[PDB]
């Protein structure tokens, strides 16, 4: 067929001209698949070998089943991503290769009950949870500081404040510092079509502060869309679990005390107001250290300031170059 080869060259010429175009948005995956073995790829031999929890930077539009995108790997190539509707077609192929996919058990029972597949055997049913295969994400995952204790205190707010002095100096003109006043741990997506849409409903959600949350969330989407990082100073997030289920999924930059014994020595050197909060400060520290290592992306446990700055700077420099 001449058409398949002609459209392949036509797509490649479109791919070649797409290396100098602005980035629109990004997507997040949660399932393992190979994009080269699929027969629906517009370009053959240039598929994507992505895995679970992989981020793709979609810039332009191609069709309703494939989207042009780029990975986060250094020196990568422009690839294609199946659409959630297209992913819905390829996921049905996985469960059809087995003996059965619906209700009828095939335990040596053939020829008596044909059992045509009902609606429960398809994706129309099973809508109690309906986890979305693809979650839309900003251009880059935000970087935030978590721990080692309750935010806002003299010991904790001041220590993380010292980091942002170095981050701004090194990354002038490419990152921005923003103070997140509103809460972020209550970012829900599958609660309602538009909770608290109007301020005159006089409802429990409408009159509360839930409405303000979405304004800050959309502010993050816009600022991150400009291909620039975001620096946040929210004082209501103390554990990584409060953002793992969130569709934002920021990078967890971990700062920790080397030993719990020396941690309480820090509080005793500040002032009488701090030892009053030392009782609750220690309780949060223990609940944070035993978090799984895979929940942390950046670590900062050195006792020296210089090694603390360059550990984050190297990762930021790598991430900045990663998207290009």
């Amino acid at each position: 067929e001449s058409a398949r080869r002609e459209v392949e060259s036509q797509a490649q010429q479109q791919l070649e001209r797409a290396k100098h175009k602005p980035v629109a948005f990004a997507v997040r995956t949660n399932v393992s698949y190979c994009g080269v073995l699929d027969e629906e790829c517009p370009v053959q031999g240039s598929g994507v070998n992505f895995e679970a929890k992989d981020f793709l930077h979609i810039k332009e539009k191609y069709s309703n089943d494939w989207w042009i995108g780029r990975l986060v790997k250094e020196g990568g190539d422009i690839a294609f991503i199946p659409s959630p509707q297209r992913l819905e077609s390829i996921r049905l192929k996985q469960e059809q290769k087995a003996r059965r996919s619906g209700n009828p058990s095939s335990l040596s029972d053939i020829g008596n009950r044909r059992s045509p597949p009902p609606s429960l055997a398809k994706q129309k049913q099973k809508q109690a949870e309906h986890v979305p295969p693809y979650d839309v994400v900003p251009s880059m995952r935000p970087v935030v500081l978590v721990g080692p204790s309750l935010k806002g205190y003299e010991v904790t707010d001041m220590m993380q404040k010292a980091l942002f002095d170095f981050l701004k100096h090194r990354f002038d003109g490419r990152i921005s510092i923003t103070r997140v006043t509103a809460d972020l741990s209550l970012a829900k997506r599958s609660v309602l079509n538009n909770p608290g849409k109007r301020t005159i409903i006089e409802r429990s959600s409408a009159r509360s502060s839930i409405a303000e949350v979405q304004s800050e969330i959309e502010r993050i989407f816009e600022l991150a869309k400009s291909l620039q990082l975001v620096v946040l100073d929210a004082d209501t997030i103390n554990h990584p679990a409060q953002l793992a289920k969130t569709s934002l999924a920021p990078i967890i930059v971990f700062v920790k005390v080397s030993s719990p014994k020396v941690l309480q020595r820090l509080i005793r050197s500040r002032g009488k107001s701090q030892m009053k909060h030392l009782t609750v400060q220690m309780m949060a520290y223990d609940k944070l250290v035993q978090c799984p290592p895979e929940s942390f992306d950046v670590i900062l446990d050195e006792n020296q300031l210089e090694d603390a700055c360059e550990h984050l700077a190297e990762y930021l420099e790598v991430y900045w170059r990663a998207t290009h």
Partner: peptide
């Protein structure tokens, strides 16, 4: 681990 966690944590504003 205390000497670093006493100056760096304090050199910012104090």
């Amino acid at each position: 681990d205390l000497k670093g966690y006493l100056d760096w944590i304090t050199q910012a504003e104090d």
